Amino acid sequence: AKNEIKVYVKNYNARGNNVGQYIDNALTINNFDTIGFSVD
Amino acid sequence: LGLNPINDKHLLRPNIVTAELTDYAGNRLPIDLSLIETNLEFDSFVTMGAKNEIKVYVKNYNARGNNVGQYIDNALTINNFDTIGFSVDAITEGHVGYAPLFKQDKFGVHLRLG
Amino acid sequence: AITEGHVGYAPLFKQDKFGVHLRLG
Amino acid sequence: RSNNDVLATSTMRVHAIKSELFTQLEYILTIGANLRKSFGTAEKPKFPS
Amino acid sequence: RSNNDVLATSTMRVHAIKSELFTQLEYILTIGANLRKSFGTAEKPKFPSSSGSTHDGIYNPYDMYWFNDYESLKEVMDYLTGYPWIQQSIKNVTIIPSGFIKQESLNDHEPVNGGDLSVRKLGKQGVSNQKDFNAISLDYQSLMFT
């Protein structure tokens, strides 16, 4: 439905074992390729 | 916070403790604990149906109570709600927001005590 | 048609907060 | 609590987390037609405002 | 580790690099027509409405069709050229990285229009793999090591 991988670092800035910043500190990927086609 | 409530009230200051709200979608709210007179109470200001938006504020923040403080001028404001697509004989599309967060049980407002 | 309404200070007013406020500090 | 009279401090960490989770959901189906009166059929359509 | 009690230091350099490389790929062919029932012919066209699936808790009015081989997708992209009124309703074909889709989020190989070809509807309510990225992760020992 929606194409996006954001990869985070586990328990960053956290005093574990709670999650830290979780995804508020993530490298976020979503410029995926789409492919063109032809029709008549 | 592991603070002794009986004689450590003078330690509720930003360089010892910090509070932040987030919806894990980039909407955030920083909080300066030196400004809550005695209670970290979160109330909200939600309008629905016609316009969908929940903004959650902190009660009497920076206030010398019992007047309201910043009220909603200091609020974590939520309104990227999901809509759902359907088909007809058009195909008009759904909008995605907090959905995949919810299938991880993280759709919600979170507080980070530091 | 169904031409839509615009919302601004409305839900503020149903909480009696539609108005201009002064913060003396 | 406000003055800058405090000791050099550098080691803040996310100490605890509490959260009001949205556990169940509700829905508004917002359409421009009165869903609770006669539609009709394909050949004879009615459009309740 | 946090205080400013450390010696004057100036000579940082990119010491090492680890990377989780996207080695193989997968494809979602996301169109607004039910690829797996009758299209018809040029003179008598039928337009099967897209059923809709639900992945990662988002309902799609469209059909999402899975492919983990280019050739598989090509064979179907080609089969589709002979039906410009069904092909008309493609939103895109996206290229994603491998191993992010759960097998039990995929229907089995159902036949296309006729068909000689099979396509796998992606739905079944399921989520994606919340992948543990390990090629790039260093446990304590391994970190201090590297």
From residue A24, alpha-carbon distances to B20, B43, B97, C14, E25 in Å are 12, 24, 15, 35, 27
Exp. method: X-ray
From residue E44, alpha-carbon distances to A26, E15, E112, E136 in Å are 52, 66, 18, 55
Chain D contact set for B10 (CB, 8 A): 1
- Resolution in angstroms, to 1 decimal, for this deposition? 4.0
Chain C contact present for B67, CB below 8 A = no
Chain D contact set for E4 (CB, 8 A): 10
Q: How far apart are CA B17 and CA B20, in angstroms?
A: 10
Query: For residue D30, which of B52, B90, B80, B100 has the smallest C-alpha distance?
Result: B52
The number of residues making up chain C comes to 25
Q: Residue written as tokens 């809709």? A: E52
E79 contacts E86 by C-beta, under 8 angstroms: no
With the C-alpha atoms ordered C16, C22, C23, C25, is the resulting torsion angle positive or negative? Answer: negative
Strand (E) or helix (H) holding E55: strand E53-55
Is D11 in contact with E4 (Cβ distance < 8 A)? no
DSSP character for B11? Answer: G
Write down the number of H helices and E strands in chain A: 0, 3
Q: How far apart are CA B98 and CA B27, in angstroms?
A: 12
DSSP character for B25? Answer: S
Number of Cα atoms under 13 Å in the Cβ half of residue B105: 2
Chain B contact set for D15 (CB, 8 A): 1-2, 17, 113-114
Count of Cβ atoms closer than 10 Å to residue A13 Cβ: 13
Which residues make Cβ contacts (< 8 Å) with residue E26, sequence separation at least 6?
E66, E67, E68, E95, E96, E97, E98, E99, E100, E101
Query: For residue D20, which of B99, B80, B100, B109 has the smallest C-alpha distance?
Result: B109
Count of Cβ atoms closer than 10 Å to residue B104 Cβ: 13
Question: B35, B44, B46, B47: which to substitute to probe chain C, counting the most C Cβ within 10 Å?
Answer: B47
Q: Is D40 left (phi over 0), alpha (psi -120 to 50) or beta?
A: left
Q: Is E83 exposed, middle or buried (CB count within 10 Å of its CB: 0-12, 13-18, 19+)?
A: buried
Q: How far apart are CA D14 and CA A21, in angstroms?
A: 8
With touching defined as 3+ CB pairs under 8 A, do chains A and B touch?
yes
